[PDB]
Each structure stands twice: as structure tokens, then as C-alpha cells.
Symmetry: D2
Subunit: 123 residues, 4 copies
């Protein structure tokens, strides 16, 4: 039921468009983040994901990576596609944002965490 394929929106108002999945559960798409942590003109950026195939079909877990075209960072999302009842799909995801640092010494503070809620876009 729960199909990643399509267009979704967030609670911060971010939007994401996701291609078609495969036998291997692969997919690609694009991301437009509403917010940034960098002082630097936001752009549409790419994602590469995967969606689990094993028997838990109905509501699968998944995860993608986003390659900021406008910053030196990377973000990764992972979560589950749910169907409340209505037949309303919801992505419940949690993500990790890695920033660039110049010496391993700094590594310690390069990782931020948090959530995101996605539901789909009309029309």
C-alpha cells in the first residue's frame, strides 16, 4: 500500500519528489528544504534511497540520503511509511545532518539529529 513514489511535504514545509522504486527497492528523486543550517542560497538537491522489500510490505521502512548541492553537508533520513486507517499515508522520519569539519579533532560536534513528518501533496 504505502508507496514512496510521488510528492511529499513536511512539517517545516519542505517538499520532496520521489521517483519509482525497483525490484531491489531503489529510488531517486529531489528535495527542496524549507530551512537550512548554512548561510547559502537553497537549491533543489538529489536523493538516493532504498525501500525495504522483505515481508512487512504494507508499511515499509526506508531511508534516503540527500546530497546538498548548496552546502558541504549531507543529511540522512530513515523511517517508516504508515497508513493511519483513513488510507492516509505518513512518513515518520528521523534524520542526521553531518557538517564539514577541517580536522578529525573536531569530529565530535559535527552531527545534529531530529525529526520530520511527511504527508502528500494534492493535485
Amino acid at each position: 500500500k504505502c508507496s514512496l513514489t510521488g510528492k511529499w511535504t513536511n512539517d517545516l514545509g519542505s517538499n520532496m519528489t520521489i521517483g519509482a522504486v525497483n525490484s531491489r527497492g531503489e529510488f531517486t528523486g529531489t528535495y527542496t528544504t524549507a530551512v537550512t543550517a548554512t548561510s547559502n542560497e537553497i537549491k533543489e538537491s538529489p536523493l538516493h534511497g532504498t525501500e525495504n522489500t522483505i515481508n512487512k510490505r504494507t508499511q515499509p521502512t526506508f531511508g534516503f540520503t540527500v546530497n546538498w548541492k548548496f552546502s558541504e553537508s549531507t543529511t540522512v533520513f530513515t523511517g517508516q511509511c504508515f497508513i493511519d486507517r483513513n488510507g492516509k499515508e505518513v512518513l515518520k522520519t528521523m534524520w542526521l545532518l553531518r557538517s564539514s569539519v577541517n580536522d578529525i579533532g573536531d569530529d565530535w560536534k559535527a552531527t545534529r539529529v531530529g525529526i520530520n513528518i511527511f504527508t502528500r501533496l494534492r493535485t
Copy 2:
């Protein structure tokens, strides 16, 4: 300088292998984990990732998603590839391991978080 391409081993005995790396930053690979949260014999699994090429640094950040073959769960990693003083490449990484719940009421207890340091296996 620091590249994803190759065989790597991490502090827990897990090994993975990367390869591709478009001019995009995309790469696929396989990952063989030493460990698990599940009670099913481990099987090589595939991974999909990306490398940041913005302001082409000698230590880019990255991130990948491991689509577990033996489980219904998913793991995502992000980090940086640094060039340590020894002259050695080190992957400092962090992750979320998302597993499946049967109901969206149990979401809150589905995501684990941890660290991993990768090193080159090849001699």
C-alpha cells in the same frame, strides 16, 4: 585525497565494500555486518550512497543507506572521510537503525543511534 572506493573494516568487525563514484557522487556497494539486533542469519546486503563534491574537499562528507537483506529494517550512516596524520584515511561515522513497528503508536520506540569508525582493509 580521501576516497570511498574500496574495502573497509570498522571497529566491530563489520566489513563493507564500495566502488562506484560518479561525477555525481553516487555509489553502491555491499556491506557485511558482524553484528545484529535481529535473530536471523546475516547475509551480505547492498548499499546506496553519495559523496559531496561541493568545493571538492580532500575530506568530503558522505552518507549511505544499507538495505538489510536478512531483516525488515534499515540503517543509514553519514560521516566524513578524513586523512589522518599517519596519512591514513579514516571514516568517522554515525548512524540510525530503524526498525519496523506494526502500529504507528509504537513509532516512538523504533530508532536506535550509534557510531562507527572505518578503516582501510586492503593492504
Copy 3:
């Protein structure tokens, strides 16, 4: 403006109650969780916390530790107390829920991470 002192409820039906608040920032309280990762009847548990008073902001950050009475685990929370537009105080919070492993080889799989938004219960 925003103070920890009181009864609060969060998006999962859990309630807690704070009280103290030295000139230090220390406070104790009790917490009654609606939810659990364990299979043992829940019992009110105590908490110990602190409030930042550096550059006495109207929205200080804080953090507390809930010493579960019904479990062998521990939870820690941190966040900020904000004054929302409505004029309402909101506790935006994030947590780690650490549980016990019998062997240090299983460490890597012991810590969960999540979010919680607290609101005032009192009328």
C-alpha cells in the same frame, strides 16, 4: 518568563511534575509515563534536573534525568522552554533512552533516541 515549575503533559499522554528551582537551577520532580519499552507495570518515577541561568533568558534550556522505578533503564531529556505566540509555554524536548545490556559487546545496541513536546496541564 518561561518556568519549569508545574504540571506538564506531552504528546504521548505522559505527565510529569516539576517543582524546585534553586538559584542554582536544580529541580526534582516526578514523571508518570504513558508509555514503555519494558513489560513491567509502570510506576511514578523521580526526576532530577537543572535550568540554565546564564544570561537569564526568558526561554532557558534545561535537562533532566528520569530514574525509572519499574525498569533497569534510564532516560535523559534536554530542551528549551519557549514562549509560544499564543503566549503559551511549550517544552520542546529530545531524549535518549538507555537500557541495560549484560555485556559490553552489546553496547552498540542499547541507546534509543527520540523527541517530546510538553505543554501545560494546569488550567
Copy 4:
């Protein structure tokens, strides 16, 4: 066996001194962090914790909060006290660092995560 009480050190070289625990498993102590995320003269700061009492004695989980006297943030640690074999104690902890933001709007990026290893101090 594993007693929080005493003086410990970190992998980043941070030191911490921990008072005596109670029946309620409480404790207090002081922290000297080797590193900071703020441009602001490091100081010895206080912690308030708790250490679980329920039957899992030998190696207990625990958690403390640190009230930076020199910044607007808070950090929280939670983890387990281990005894490899030697009779060497090790704290394996993971922590959450909350920074101050000026509008709930920003909340999204105020949380950093990571680890820390503690072993004790001679003499």
C-alpha cells in the same frame, strides 16, 4: 561493583568528579570539558545525576546533566558502567548537547549527538 563515585577521564580528555550516591541513587559532582562548541572561556561546571538502583547492580546504567556555567547550553549524558574483566571500569556514554535558539522556529537545529568514553584517574 561499578561505582560512579570518584574521578574519571574521557577520550577527549575531559575530566569529571563525582560525589557519593544515595539510597535513591543520587549524586552530584563537577565537570571540566576539554572542548567546547562555544567561543567562551571554559569553566568547571556542575552535574546532577542518578544511578539506577533496580537489580542489575554489578553494572548499572546512569545519567547526568551538566549545567554549563560558561555557556547557554545544556548537555545530557546517559550510559552504562562496565567491568571488562580486569575489574577495569568503563563508562560508555552517549550524549545530547542542546544549544539556545531565539524562536521555537529554529528548534529544529538545536540538537547535537555523539559519544564519550570514561575510565578512571590514578592517584
